[PDB]
Structure formats: structure tokens, C-alpha cells
Design a protein around this nucleic acid. Structure first.
Ligand SMILES: [Mg+2]
Ligand SMILES: [Mg+2]
Ligand SMILES: [Mg+2]
Ligand SMILES: [Mg+2]
Ligand SMILES: [Mg+2]
Ligand SMILES: [Mg+2]
Ligand SMILES: [Mg+2]
Ligand SMILES: [Mg+2]
Ligand SMILES: [Mg+2]
Ligand SMILES: [Mg+2]
Ligand SMILES: [Mg+2]
Ligand SMILES: [Mg+2]
Ligand SMILES: [Mg+2]
Ligand SMILES: [Mg+2]
Ligand SMILES: [Mg+2]
Ligand SMILES: [Mg+2]
Ligand SMILES: [Mg+2]
Ligand SMILES: [Mg+2]
Ligand SMILES: [Mg+2]
Ligand SMILES: [Mg+2]
Ligand SMILES: [Mg+2]
Ligand SMILES: [Mg+2]
Ligand SMILES: [Mg+2]
Ligand SMILES: [Mg+2]
Ligand SMILES: [Mg+2]
Ligand SMILES: [Mg+2]
Ligand SMILES: [Mg+2]
Ligand SMILES: [Mg+2]
Ligand SMILES: [Mg+2]
Ligand SMILES: [Mg+2]
Ligand SMILES: [Mg+2]
Ligand SMILES: [Mg+2]
Ligand SMILES: [Mg+2]
Ligand SMILES: [Mg+2]
Ligand SMILES: [Mg+2]
Ligand SMILES: [Mg+2]
Ligand SMILES: [Mg+2]
Ligand SMILES: [Mg+2]
Ligand SMILES: [Mg+2]
Ligand SMILES: [Mg+2]
Ligand SMILES: [Mg+2]
Ligand SMILES: [Mg+2]
Ligand SMILES: [Mg+2]
Ligand SMILES: [Mg+2]
Ligand SMILES: [Mg+2]
Ligand SMILES: [Mg+2]
Ligand SMILES: [Mg+2]
Ligand SMILES: [Mg+2]
Ligand SMILES: [Mg+2]
Lengths: 51, 64, 52, 77, 76
RNA sequence: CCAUAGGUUAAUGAGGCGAACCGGGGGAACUGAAACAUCUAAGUACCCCGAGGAAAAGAAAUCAACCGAGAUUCCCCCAG
RNA sequence: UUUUGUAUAAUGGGUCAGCGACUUAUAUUCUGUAGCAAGGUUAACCGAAUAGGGGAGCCGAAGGGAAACCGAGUCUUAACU
RNA sequence: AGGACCGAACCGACUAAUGUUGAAAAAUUAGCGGAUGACUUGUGGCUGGGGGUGAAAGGCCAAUCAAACCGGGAGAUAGCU
RNA sequence: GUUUAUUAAAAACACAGCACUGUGCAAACACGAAAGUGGACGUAUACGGUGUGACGCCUGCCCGGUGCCGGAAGGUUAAUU
RNA sequence: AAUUCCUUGUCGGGUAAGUUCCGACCUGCACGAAUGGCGUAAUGAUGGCCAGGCUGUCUCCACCCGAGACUCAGUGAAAUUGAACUCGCUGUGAAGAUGCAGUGUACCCGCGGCAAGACGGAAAGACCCCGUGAACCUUUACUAUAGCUUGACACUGAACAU
RNA sequence: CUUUAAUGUUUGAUGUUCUAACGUUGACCCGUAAUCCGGGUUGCGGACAGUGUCUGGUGGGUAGUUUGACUGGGGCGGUCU
RNA sequence: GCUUGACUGCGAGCGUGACGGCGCGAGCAGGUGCGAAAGCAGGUCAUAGUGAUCCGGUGGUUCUGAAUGGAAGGGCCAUC
């Protein structure tokens, strides 16, 4: 139970750190986001087919 | 709702026996002639996914 | 870059070819070299062709 | 309104495309024309608002037969 | 300005030092020009990369009229 | 000129209202894509028409695969 | 509270009382725990109905390869010590 | 005769003082301009929001205008506080 | 004369006049998916648009660029076949 | 010059003294002919400059008449406010101290006044920057599109001549 | 095969003349107590015009947006492998 | 002087990168070249001369071929 006082050890920030995307309500990047670069599953080429 | 797999990643990674993922090497599409044969030969075989990117791959592939 | 890439096609008819570059201002004559052909597993003469 | 009295064709909506596939809403309207059809049985001219496709079916179906359907349709020619 | 350019460092230098046991094919030193020369059981790459041609201990020695520095492998 | 349009009566019927659900006619943008045009949002919001207690759909010019199944609708799988 | 750093002459609050912010659903992975175990478990639905039925399916015990294929091997290659 | 002159009503709003928690969410006091005209006013009517209207300032369109107000999409979004 | 109602009344806007240009009347143009309406129950001595802005003396040179107007032989060129 | 940067250009007039004004000069940074040029009577709550009259505008303020301010009675707000037992100086210090250090001064508390400070009050700064913010507007930015325009086909036929 | 002279054919290119589609915001009659509309008569125009689909050109008329970062603030300059 | 090793399949073991990746490599197999041979040759004294993925193009390929036989298309190899 985060954000329930100093003694709990998870108060006033809820374990989210300080003013990042993870600290915003509904914040955070999608799966595979690499900071702006095209992710590895897009740097690498497709191969093969499904039989 | 059911989690949706990232279809772009599902077409490039196959799970292996010990839980790894294999992918084909890059840099072998259309500027390969100027690359030495030894370089091209090493890119031909399949490769293992590095440890740093394992978490990202698993996130994109929750059902495989 | 003004040197243009060319392909060397095997004379054995396998359809295997190598690729390289050649200077077009000089050496107009076609390039002939003895190179290994993986299909016949022998070194044969490769003839210059056009990349397309 | 822009309704064919024979075939019932009415305006329909679609997209203007482009070389960039951009889609903008548009309308397709029938090729309607007011024509005076000669009905032999009454020896009279009756004016109908018909499409170009409707004109073709009038020759094939006969002037009397289409009007019989129109009276069944209650279109009030 | 018209400056402020450099290339990534290529990490040259000695990888295995004197008396170390190495496997055949292990590169001992990567260099620019023949700072070291290949001796017994040591090969020289196309970029003057010295590699071990046999298992054994790395030994540095100075021989010859030019007072040059040579690397050899004593394969026991 | 017959006719026809038109006109006058007489019979029936319809008008409007009402929550959601239903069918059809139209139909966004914000947003997401860490921008933004294709795309997404979404045939959603909204507008319009019509009907019922349900509506709609429905009795193969359907699927299967060389074996067969036998209208439509709904549920769980198939399957992210 | 925010900061490298605040008695700071940086932000917030006149005071009290009440209210006021990490939840829910589904899926997935990991840990703990319980059951069964090379097996485990059912969903819809049926059902006097939290039982029972329903194993339709799902996961696991075999993988390699783009695939056909082969299989404790397999792929690569003409072939691999 | 006159978009003539001086000057009340009427209409305008140039200067200054006061007022600035106002007597008044734009006014008062003393002066000022027009004052038979492109004047002013009453009562009705018409033009509706990417639209109106504008002797044109991005002015005005119910104390709100470089895109009114109300409801809906909507708990828009907010890498910011 | 008009203007920023509510910090700007001006040298700004308008203005008569002037010039260019469009417009032959089912006029151009404008408002309207359209019908229609305004223009106008008017007809080039008319109407719309643009710039200039009483009056006086005047308004010179450049058609290369960009527009507009005229030409249509040739070059190029869509749907269609 | 409603244009001139250098610049208060130079000369003349006006003044005791004139970076403004007026007249000329031309060296027009960077005027110019209907995005009009130059003049122009009249007009102007038009801008600048000068003179006469006139005056507390001023030298330099004085007095007086009223309405407040002050006192009493009645009614009775507001913005603001972490809490205060709320001094000066010098130094220090999220770098300009009522609150720290040192030191000095100061009996407790009102009332009428003045505003130097409390980085006083007002309003999540309008300037600056930032956000892969918003909106309007411009154009030979991009992609479209209404409209306009071209041709083919359809509505749409006959005959003849080349 | 070339050169092709003529020959029918099949498609077009214009030009001329018709009316019967179509147009008539020409006249007249009726619906009709009616400057709408419709019908009738007639004239004029006429396979045009006009409209539909497709298509080329034009199109800030109207939209949706883009218009980089580093940087002894930013812009400008410079830089980006 | 003679030549095409500017070879094909591979690669023990290492280096350097967060990663994508980049670099070095004896030796092995098949075929070569130069040497009488020992041997050397998987480009150039070395370190710059470069661009991921998607999409599309070209050649090869018994990999696939949505009822079946083909084919299209896709895959793989070479390559733009
Ligand atoms: Mg803690
Ligand atoms: Mg944080
Ligand atoms: Mg915080
Ligand atoms: Mg976005
Ligand atoms: Mg009922
Ligand atoms: Mg401190
Ligand atoms: Mg404070
Ligand atoms: Mg406060
Ligand atoms: Mg468990
Ligand atoms: Mg049960
Ligand atoms: Mg089963
Ligand atoms: Mg193996
Ligand atoms: Mg007057
Ligand atoms: Mg007067
Ligand atoms: Mg006057
Ligand atoms: Mg207002
Ligand atoms: Mg708006
Ligand atoms: Mg609203
Ligand atoms: Mg929404
Ligand atoms: Mg919100
Ligand atoms: Mg005036
Ligand atoms: Mg004002
Ligand atoms: Mg006014
Ligand atoms: Mg004023
Ligand atoms: Mg003017
Ligand atoms: Mg010219
Ligand atoms: Mg010209
Ligand atoms: Mg000056
Ligand atoms: Mg002087
Ligand atoms: Mg002068
Ligand atoms: Mg000028
Ligand atoms: Mg001129
Ligand atoms: Mg001019
Ligand atoms: Mg004056
Ligand atoms: Mg005087
Ligand atoms: Mg104090
Ligand atoms: Mg101090
Ligand atoms: Mg002090
Ligand atoms: Mg006091
Ligand atoms: Mg005072
Ligand atoms: Mg004061
Ligand atoms: Mg303050
Ligand atoms: Mg702020
Ligand atoms: Mg601000
Ligand atoms: Mg930025
Ligand atoms: Mg725009
Ligand atoms: Mg948008
Ligand atoms: Mg920047
Ligand atoms: Mg099939």
C-alpha cells in the first residue's frame, strides 16, 4: 500500500520516482519503445513464412 | 481483453528450446557487394537475441 | 562515385554469378577470370554481364 | 428530389481519393433527365424523371409494363 | 569554429601480457604498424594483429640487429 | 371532339408522444501513431427515417474436400 | 514542495471539522502457497444447481529447420572431425 | 439655396480633475464637437458562428469575439506543474 | 462626415472626382448541393470589381520577371480505344 | 522631409542662449509621379513653432469658504493572514536578515500622522525561453478540395457534302 | 517486298440542311379570383446548350498539417556521418 | 615473369560494442594460382572511401502452391 506515510517506505511518491512518465497518471511508453529509435523488432528484417 | 501480440515482432522472432529467441542478422539486404565475403558469410547464419533486449522481446511476445 | 558495379556470370549455365566493379573510361574489353563455381564445384571462367 | 422514377436510383456517397490516398467525402448522383414518354394506350405524352440507365430498361420492358409497376408503387407519375 | 571532430577509440594495446597462458588463435596485441613482430608459434594478421598459433605462455624478447621487440609462444 | 388534368362530395386510414434496445439514411473531431497526411479513434458521438415486443436475419447459385455437412440467431473455443 | 543548495526575502496554507488521490476488469509473466502430477485442468452449457455432468478445448512431456521434411537429434554444406 | 454659420433640446465623447473595495464592472463635475442632415429616434422586421455584419478598428454579434453562447464526443489530450 | 461600446477620433476609413477592367441582360457577380433570389422589375449615359482620392499644374522610361489578354503552326500531354 | 544613419549636416531668420520651428543648400544612408507627384483658398476638439493679452503655472506660497479627515453616539465591511514573545548595526547565509553570529540600544500600552522596509497587497509573468502546446493569418511550403475549365461517354436523332 | 493507281469496307474530321429529343427567365389558351407551377397552342433555338460518370489543367477560394536539434539565454553564424 | 585466392562452404579461440553491430583468426573441406620445393595467396602497409528496416526490381532454387494438377503469389539463395 503505497503513499500512506513516511514509515511505509513508499509514501509521497508511490514508488514511481520523481516526475517521470512513470509518475504521471496514465503515463508510460508503449511496448518496444526505445527512446525514439526504431526498435530492434524493426531494425532487423523479416524472414520466412507460415505453412 | 486478451493481450495483442506485436505482429511486427512475431514475424521475426521464434522461441527456442531454452526460452531464447532467434533472429536473422541485419546488414545483408542491398549494400552487401562492397562487404567482404567473410563478413557476408558470418551474417548468413541465425543469431541469438542478446540478454539486454530479452525483456523487450518478451513484452512484445506475451503468448510465445 | 562514378565507378559502376558489374556482375560476372559463369559460362557453365548454372546461373551463378559474382559481382564487382570496373572502370568504364578505360578497359572497354570484357573481363574474363577463372573463378570457383559452387554449383559444379570447379573453377571455371566467368564472363562480364550487366547488373539488372 | 434526385430520385429515378423507374429504377429508384438515388444519390450515394463516397470518397475522393488522390495519389496520397487522402479520402474526402463526396456524392454520386444519377444521370437523371426529364423525358416525355409516348404512351400508346392513352395516345398521350407523360413526362418522367428518369436516369440514363432507366431509359434503357423502358425499351426492353415496354412503356405500359413499367407504368403498371409504377401504379403498384404509388409513385404518382 | 571548423573543428571538434574525432573518431571512436579503437582499444589498441596489449591484451595478454608476459607469461600468460593463451589458446591458439587468441590475439595478444592489436596495434598500428609492427610495434611488435611475430615470433615462434605466433601469427600476424592482415592488420598486423598478432595471434597465437599454438597454446602456451606468452614471452616477450628482444633480438636481432635492429633491437626490435618480438613475441613468441613456448608451447610445452 | 372524346378524353385527361382539375373540381365537389362520401367513406375509411394516417397525423403526435414516449426510456433503452432494433433496422436503415447520413456521419465527425479530439485522441493514438510520443510530430503528422495513409491508418487509428470509428461507422463510435451526433443527426435523420421506420418498426416491434423484440427487431433484424433466415430455409444454400452455403460450406467442405473426393469424406461429408445441411436455414437463421446467440454462447464458449478455434485465436490474438 | 522543488532543488547542487532554502531560516531563506523561492511555492503552498487565515483556522477548524467533513470530504479528497495507485482502483477495477481481462489477459500475461514472475514469486509465494495449496492440490494433483507426466500429466494438470475444464469453458460455455446441463443441472435442485457453489454438487454433479460437460475434457469442446488449453498448457506440458521433443526439437531442429524459412519450409518441405527429419527427429534425440536437427539445421548448415557436396560433406562436415 | 446650403452634408452653410452661432447656439438649447437631442446626439456625440476631445481635455483635465475626481473616482479606482466607485453614487456607477467606464460614470460625475467644468469645459468640448455636431446640432435640416451621410442627422437623430420610437415601434416592429431581416441577416447566425468559419457564419453574420462592418464609411474597415480584427471592430461588433446579450458585461464574452483572430472565430459567440449551450449541450454532447468528454473523465479530449497535457513528455508540464 | 465615420471609426477601435470600455486607455488610441487621427495624418487612419469614407468621400465627390479620376482611371483601368469585367459585364449584351436566362448579363457578369453574389447568396444558395438545387430550385430560386438579389443584381433589377435596371440594359453600357447601366451595373460589378479594383486602385486613386476635391480642385489646380501634371502623371515620364521598362513587357526581362510575375499575372492578364490575344494567337495556334509545331513540340509535349488525360480519360477513351 | 511624417523619409537623412552619420547628424544637434551647413548657412540664414527668430532668442541673452533654439538638438524644435521657419528659409535655403543637396552630400536623396534609403523621395518621386494614380501603391500618384507638386502646389492649394477654405476647413480641423489635426501635429510642431512663435507673438500679444492673460493669469498662483511658477518665483513662493499665504489666507479664507465649504466637503472629508479628528472626537462622540448608532449601524458596521473588505482585500490579506504558517505561527510570532515582530529593535539597530556589522558580518554571515538559496549569495540584499525582525528571527543566525557578534554587538549596541530599548519601561508596558494606545491615539493622530508619514510611507523607507517587511524582496508589501492584486493577478500560477504579457518580456525571454521551452513543449515534437493551441489558435488565427500569409505564400511560387506539403497534401487535398469547393469552384472554374478540357475532353471521352451517356441524355443524343436524320439527311447530304466533301 | 517496294512503289503503290484505282476498288469496297471500317472508323473518324469538318461543313451544310432538317426536327423529333432537349432548351425557351418568347407569344397565346386553360387549370384560375394566380407575374408560382403544370398542361395546351405557337415561335425561336437545336443535336448544340445544359446535366451525369470519368478525365487533364487551374484553384490560400476553403481545409488538415509541417516548418529539427546542439548552442556560456535565444536568434543569426557554425555544427550533425 | 606467370597469373586471378579480389576462391566456395566453414571455422577452434579471441577483441570491441548497452544493443543493432564491427573487427581479428589458426585450422578443416572442396577447387585453384605461383613456385623445383619448403611454402604463400579468403584482395590492396594498416587505420577513412559509408546507410538499418520496410516496399519494390532482377537471376537462381523440387521450399510452399487455400478441392486436385499447375500457376499466381510467397519463401530461400544470389543481387539491385
Ligand atoms: Mg524509501
Ligand atoms: Mg521519476
Ligand atoms: Mg513531485
Ligand atoms: Mg499524434
Ligand atoms: Mg405490441
Ligand atoms: Mg540550512
Ligand atoms: Mg517565506
Ligand atoms: Mg498564500
Ligand atoms: Mg502457485
Ligand atoms: Mg462444477
Ligand atoms: Mg481432446
Ligand atoms: Mg548438432
Ligand atoms: Mg452644417
Ligand atoms: Mg452649434
Ligand atoms: Mg463645424
Ligand atoms: Mg461584447
Ligand atoms: Mg475555430
Ligand atoms: Mg460546449
Ligand atoms: Mg472520445
Ligand atoms: Mg481532463
Ligand atoms: Mg470633422
Ligand atoms: Mg476607446
Ligand atoms: Mg460610436
Ligand atoms: Mg478617445
Ligand atoms: Mg487614399
Ligand atoms: Mg514581352
Ligand atoms: Mg509580361
Ligand atoms: Mg534625426
Ligand atoms: Mg543655426
Ligand atoms: Mg526646412
Ligand atoms: Mg513613395
Ligand atoms: Mg506611371
Ligand atoms: Mg501606380
Ligand atoms: Mg495645425
Ligand atoms: Mg501671451
Ligand atoms: Mg517585523
Ligand atoms: Mg546584511
Ligand atoms: Mg537591518
Ligand atoms: Mg496607528
Ligand atoms: Mg502620507
Ligand atoms: Mg504615502
Ligand atoms: Mg508583491
Ligand atoms: Mg508563469
Ligand atoms: Mg505565460
Ligand atoms: Mg523545440
Ligand atoms: Mg492554410
Ligand atoms: Mg489533428
Ligand atoms: Mg533549440
Ligand atoms: Mg484454392
Amino acid at each position: 500500500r503505497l503513499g500512506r506515510g513516511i514509515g511505509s517506505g513508499l509514501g509521497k511518491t508511490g514508488g514511481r520516482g520523481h516526475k517521470g512518465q512513470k509518475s504521471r497518471s496514465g503515463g508510460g511508453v508503449r511496448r518496444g519503445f526505445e527512446g525514439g529509435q526504431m526498435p530492434l523488432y524493426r531494425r532487423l528484417p523479416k524472414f520466412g513464412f507460415t505453412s | 481483453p486478451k493481450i495483442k501480440t506485436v505482429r511486427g515482432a512475431a514475424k521475426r522472432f521464434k522461441k527456442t528450446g531454452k526460452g531464447g529467441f532467434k533472429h536473422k542478422h541485419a546488414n545483408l539486404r542491398h549494400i552487401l557487394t562492397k562487404k567482404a565475403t567473410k563478413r557476408k558469410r558470418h551474417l548468413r547464419p541465425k543469431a541469438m537475441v542478446s540478454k539486454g533486449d530479452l525483456g523487450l522481446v518478451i513484452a512484445c511476445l506475451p503468448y510465445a | 562515385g562514378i565507378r559502376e558495379k558489374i556482375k560476372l556470370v559463369s559460362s557453365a549455365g548454372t546461373g551463378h554469378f559474382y559481382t564487382t566493379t570496373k572502370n568504364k573510361r578505360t578497359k572497354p574489353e570484357k573481363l574474363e577470370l577463372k573463378k570457383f563455381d559452387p554449383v559444379v564445384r570447379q573453377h571455371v571462367i566467368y564472363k562480364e554481364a550487366k547488373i539488372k | 428530389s434526385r430520385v429515378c422514377q423507374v429504377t429508384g436510383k438515388r444519390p450515394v456517397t463516397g470518397n475522393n481519393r488522390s495519389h496520397a490516398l487522402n479520402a474526402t467525402k463526396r456524392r454520386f448522383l444519377p444521370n437523371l433527365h426529364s423525358h416525355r414518354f409516348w404512351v400508346e394506350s392513352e395516345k398521350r405524352f407523360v413526362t418522367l424523371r428518369v436516369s440514363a440507365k432507366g431509359m434503357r430498361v423502358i425499351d426492353k420492358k415496354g412503356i405500359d409494363t413499367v407504368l403498371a409497376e409504377l401504379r403498384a408503387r404509388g409513385e404518382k407519375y | 569554429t571548423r573543428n571538434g571532430r574525432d573518431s571512436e577509440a579503437k582499444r589498441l594495446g596489449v591484451k595478454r601480457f608476459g607469461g600468460e597462458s593463451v589458446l591458439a588463435g587468441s590475439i595478444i596485441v592489436r596495434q598500428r604498424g609492427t610495434k611488435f613482430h611475430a615470433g615462434a608459434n605466433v601469427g600476424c594478421g592482415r592488420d598486423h594483429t598478432l595471434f597465437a598459433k599454438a597454446d602456451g605462455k606468452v614471452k616477450f624478447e628482444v633480438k636481432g640487429p635492429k633491437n626490435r621487440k618480438f613475441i613468441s609462444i613456448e608451447a610445452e
